[PDB]
Amino acid sequence: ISVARSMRAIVNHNEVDRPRGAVAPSSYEMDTGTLSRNGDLLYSPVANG
Amino acid sequence: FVPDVPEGYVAVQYAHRLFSSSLANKRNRVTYTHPPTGMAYPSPTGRPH
């Protein structure tokens, strides 16, 4: 367990590029894909086609 | 009378992520990282122009 979670430790040290334990949000958590002509909620395509 | 920019002044275009937060000898000074070279600059003096 740490199962339900998204981000951790929003802070920045004196010196380091991230405090080594920090979890960025999920690339899938920010994503609005549209809904289709059937009620769907697709994600945004990795595409091209 | 728009005073023209001097001679050596280099054009770091203000982005948002070159103004971080390091530790320059005992504090958490806001620090600038020049982009044409790499250098830190943890205090506003003798910067890069």
Side-chain angles (χ1 to χ4, degrees):
Chain A
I1 168 67
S2 294
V3 294
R5 188 178 65 193
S6 61
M7 296 174 284
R8 179 167 178 264
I10 298 99
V11 284
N12 46 29
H13 288 173
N14 297 284
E15 77 292 12
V16 279
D17 289 345
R18 70 167 64 196
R20 67 179 296 175
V23 179
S26 181
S27 176
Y28 301 127
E29 184 174 0
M30 306 169 190
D31 176 67
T32 54
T34 312
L35 50 73
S36 176
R37 59 175 62 88
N38 190 32
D40 283 351
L41 295 176
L42 304 177
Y43 290 109
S44 296
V46 66
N48 189 342
Chain B
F1 143 60
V2 105
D4 43 328
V5 252
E7 196 65 303
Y9 290 89
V10 50
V12 328
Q13 147 159 56
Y14 170 103
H16 203 195
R17 63 103 198 309
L18 32 50
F19 254 114
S20 83
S21 187
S22 42
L23 157 113
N25 70 223
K26 308 258 242 211
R27 17 180 333 167
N28 278 345
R29 315 242 36 215
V30 197
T31 148
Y32 168 55
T33 291
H34 203 262
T37 165
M39 212 19 170
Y41 296 129
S43 71
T45 162
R47 286 258 178 121
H49 293 328

